[model samples]
Target: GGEVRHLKMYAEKLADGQMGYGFEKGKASVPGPLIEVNEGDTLHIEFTNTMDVRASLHVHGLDYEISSDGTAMNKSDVEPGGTRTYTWRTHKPGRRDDGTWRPGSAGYWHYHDHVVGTEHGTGGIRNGLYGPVIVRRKGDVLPDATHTIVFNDMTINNRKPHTGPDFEATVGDRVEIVMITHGEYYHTFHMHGHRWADNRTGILTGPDDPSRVIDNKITGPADSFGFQIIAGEGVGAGAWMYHCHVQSHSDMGMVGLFLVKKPDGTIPGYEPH
Candidate 1:
């Protein structure tokens, strides 16, 4: 019930001294493209480093071997202008021999370089070498579309202060958000007029579900979570604010807008600044 997939990714240097991963040669971004798959699938990524430095693709919450570890010690990091194939495998949840449960490799995960400045690729991550990964179970609900939000060193998606990347959605659209954190500090993620269940899929199973419905969440380095919501579900369409709730962080420009437009394609009271 699985499929083998192959992809080509490139790492390049950006104009602002940042790095990114792209499916093509020169289309790299601060936060790289999304890598999504279903459980029981495997990915073999041919990662190429175009920049004049070492880099590798290290992923979280998936299975791989030391040959694909994406670390210096494992000798998985690709040299400048070099290419390497990193394999990642996913499996469905099942029962163990002792009747215990084993969790599946389905979750909101991420990837990054592991050998830029140091053994941990601290410099690479700070600059931009990261992306989002989502592995879904068989019955998981799919969204209309997905967006990524990365809180890296007080900036959203590596943007300048107060210019965080904004997301747009129409009323009644199912919008999925993948939130990932990196860098050196902690911050709270808050979205106005929207809330989600704190569960595997960020959706309530039913009225008796035990997940908490929250609008704000605290996250630290390497922490990632995802959720989906109906745009302007009850509240009318407007510009909703999504930002880091930490006082100084938000003041330093860690904010963006969730522009939810009405079916008529108008957002009430929204004017570009």
Candidate 2:
């Protein structure tokens, strides 16, 4: 049995981070709010188009009816100063051998303004119309702490702010990093002292895949993934760096520091961002 989840979204101007170009409902997230919903839930979103032009919430990585596709192509849109309810079904579940149930979708994905841009995803994304979405399972224990760090073509999390404050975690804690792409190109998400054994989505393998224990991976526009790491586990406690491996992007403020505290809740070699 699943339930319906509701969300209210307003498309308007918002001052987000170091970047003056951003918006969210009374929030300053450049990429907007990171919407969270559990597996097997239906999203009933009431969106008001606050912009002069039409806008809609086109999604990625989920199952849904065409009417709620949130696209302008054949589908309807939430017009300026207008409101509409978009319904999209999410997640899938299956029976376990023990006669129990489990969440079929548990990972990182994203949603964006598909209507305001080219059908192939251009203008809107480049103009900062996107956000990350996390779909957790009904009963699971992972991602003890999370960070939805977005990598725009030129910014980190839609701004140039210091990454230290939002990236801290207690030693031995499990940390989940959710990544999504926007802007015009691709970027390599890399961090010091942390790596994984498979694609965040467990997708097909390729070069520098997470499974190789490589600290870096690449992502393109509309591409998203999630991965976890043990905070200062085998590497011990200290402040480390996380950023786009691209020198150009990192120089443009697409970087930050990961502050891993000691078990006693103290950072030995920490420096403020």
Candidate 3:
């Protein structure tokens, strides 16, 4: 985990929204790049395919080979504007053998564009490339900010926010949330005030003693998870609410708002939007 991180991604055709196909550097992000690595690093990703058609750059968590495993049955295509490069060899607490002591792989990950339409047909990821990959262990301390939430059928990041997305924090930030999903229904990520039981793959929690508490969590269809909390301690400061409680998808708006502030940081009846 010494060094090396040269990233320059692109799959284009989504400058704003209402349409899809993203992952950027020249702007275009429903979620792509916010990657963090530290447990034995060596990730040099360089993907560019302006998106008129063919696309590639697949990833799920860590550990790579097979030409960096970009998929298309490892054909790893990258047509359109053409450009491809992938290489990752990371680790956190995993790496053992006859002595056995495998703790885990690392934490929170997702990366997409398996081919235009993922499985194929008009560029996959339902037309949004996908993103979010964080793997840290040796000293890892970053999460005073980080957010990526896209659970299709509606619950976006780069667009569609008539109800959700206003999760700003203050009182003592330490937030990192990454969740991904696309189509076919199945959702349950309820956060009314606070909690963190984490198991069932929310993040790290081995060696027992996990589940201190929890609010809700569920997903389907290309699902993913990552969690962390501590914004206003036990639930204090402000408009705390986070939707997708799943009753007919919260009656079609999926909710939002968690502008916690106060503690001198302000945001009571003053400002926050």
**How does each model score on lDDT?**
0.93, 0.70, 0.69
Better of 2 and 3 by TM-score: 2
lDDT of 1: 0.93
Query: In terms of TM-score, how similar is model 1 to the real structure?
Result: 0.98
What local lDDT score does residue 228 receive in model 1, on the 0 to 100 scale? 96
Compared with the true structure, the alpha-carbon lDDT of candidate 2 equals 0.70
The per-residue C-alpha lDDT of model 2 at residue 20 equals 15
lDDT of 2 by residue, 1-273 (tens): 467888777766443312111234455355667777778888888877776766777788767678767777756677778888877677667798999996566668877776665664456566667777787766544678667777776777556444432578888888887888777778998888777655544332466554555678888877888877888878877777888888877776677888888877767755445
In model 3, the Cα lDDT at residue 98 comes to 72
**Any runs in candidate 3 off by more than 4 Å, and if so which?**
1-38, 41-57, 60-63, 76-88, 91-110, 118-122, 126-129, 142-146, 149-161, 168-170, 177-258, 261-267, 270-273
Candidate 1 residue pairs in backbone clash? 162-253
**By TM-score, how accurate is candidate 3?**
0.34
Q: Judged by TM-score, which candidate is best?
A: 1
Q: On residues 1-273, what C-alpha lDDT tens digit does candidate 3 reach at each position?
A: 457778777777764432233345467666665677776787887877776677777677678888766666767777788887888767657557777777645677777766665454234566566777777676555677888787775665534556567778886788878877766678888877777656533544555755646778788766777777878786568877777887766677777777889767766776646
Error of 3 at 24 (Å): 28
Q: Alpha-carbon error at 195 in model 1, in Å?
A: 0.4
- C-alpha TM-scores of all predictions: 0.98, 0.80, 0.34
